[PDB]
């Protein structure tokens, strides 16, 4: 039923074009994948060609990357906090790309103690806000993957002016 054909729209002049032809299979769309936090739950989608797309209907874990330190760890996703496109995705805790989520900081905390031996010092120094978040127990991260296409919720921890701007918006 969903279609991407541009024939139905009005012409640039504003004329109402007539229905040229029936809907074709090569111009289809599929229903959105409202990823919500919960037990992992994905089903494959057989797309054009032999390719396959994974639909992340539900997901609770993701690989998140600390870019400044250039490390990546698998962490649980606590909950959505702020989403730029629409707010009501925040209310229902829906996951999509560019959504800001709160992730458990425990693996990063353990790794940091392992690598730096601190709860040498100048390198260990990190932004004040990130240390405050570590104290809190949850880290603000931005999802970089597209859960409705690849079935993953990979992303990275907010840092610097990213963190400043999003904290202001919060």
């Amino acid at each position: 039923g969903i279609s991407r054909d541009s024939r139905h729209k009005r012409s640039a002049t504003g004329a109402k074009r007539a229905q040229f032809r029936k809907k074709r299979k090569f111009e289809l769309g599929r229903q959105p994948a409202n990823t919500k936090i919960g037990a992992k739950r994905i089903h494959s989608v057989r797309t054009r060609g032999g390719n396959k797309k994974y639909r992340a209907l539900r997901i609770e874990t993701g690989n998140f990357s600390w870019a400044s330190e250039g490390i990546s760890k698998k962490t649980r996703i606590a909950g959505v906090v702020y989403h730029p496109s629409n707010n009501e995705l925040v209310r229902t805790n829906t996951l999509t790309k560019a959504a800001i989520v709160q992730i458990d900081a425990t693996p990063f905390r353990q790794w940091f103690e392992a690598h730096y031996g601190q709860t040498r010092a100048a390198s260990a120094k990190i932004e004040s806000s990130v240390e405050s978040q570590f104290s809190a127990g949850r880290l603000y991260a931005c999802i970089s993957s597209r859960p409705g296409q690849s079935g993953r919720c990979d992303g990275y921890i907010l840092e610097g002016e990213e963190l400043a701007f999003y904290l202001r918006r919060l």
Partner: protein, 137 residues
Amino acid sequence: VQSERAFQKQPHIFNNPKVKTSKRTKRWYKNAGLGFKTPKTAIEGSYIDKKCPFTGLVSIRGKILTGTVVSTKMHRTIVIRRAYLHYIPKYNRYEKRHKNVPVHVSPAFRVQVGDIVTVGQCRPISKTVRFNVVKVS
């Protein structure tokens, strides 16, 4: 710059806060070719534009056209006017015709209603925008 709900950044360009080597935020740019000079204001500017041919994820290829600006009342897009003479054989006569072409204009350019612009074709930016301003004069 950051006048939107979502943050604006050049994708996959990373600025390492820990190293803090440079005061200036790292900026990525390319030269569009066809002898079209990339302006400096793009190089050391601070705007973010995904559809800028010099800083965005767009490539200029295909026909290159010229026209006169007729409207600039939009955010980062304009309407130019291309005139020509259409020949009717039956009345063996020319008639003045014009077509209005919408075009994306990068913020690295400053354009007024009336100046001449050379534009290059690009992948469909919007419903009607298929071109991108590449030289103002």
